[PDB]
Amino acid sequence: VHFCDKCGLPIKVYGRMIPCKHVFCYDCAILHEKKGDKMCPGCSDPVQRIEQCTRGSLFMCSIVQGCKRTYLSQRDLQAHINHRHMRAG
Numbered sequence: 001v002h003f004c005d006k007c008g009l010p011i012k013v014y015g016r017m018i019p020c021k022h023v024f025c026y027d028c029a030i031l032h033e034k035k036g037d038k039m040c041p042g043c044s045d046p047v048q049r050i051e052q053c054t055r056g057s058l059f060m061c062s063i064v065q066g067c068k069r070t071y072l073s074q075r076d077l078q079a080h081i082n083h084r085h086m087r088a089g
Ligand SMILES: [Zn+2]
Pocket: 004, 006, 007, 008, 009, 011, 025, 027, 028
């Protein structure tokens, strides 16, 4: 994503979080890890490990609602559509 989901500021680096597979600002994403070490900035999920990536290394999904399940290969993001959207309905 561009604007951090927790800070809203323009993400300069893709702070990827696992196993959520969610992205944020690798800067505020690490401050959160140093804060709880296991809570996504917005999903508050067990942040296993945060990693930095380029704003072109993940694939954002845009089907309906706020589905921002990024991935590492269109095949996984495509697999996300048929796994949770299935043509929406
Ligand atoms: Zn931020």
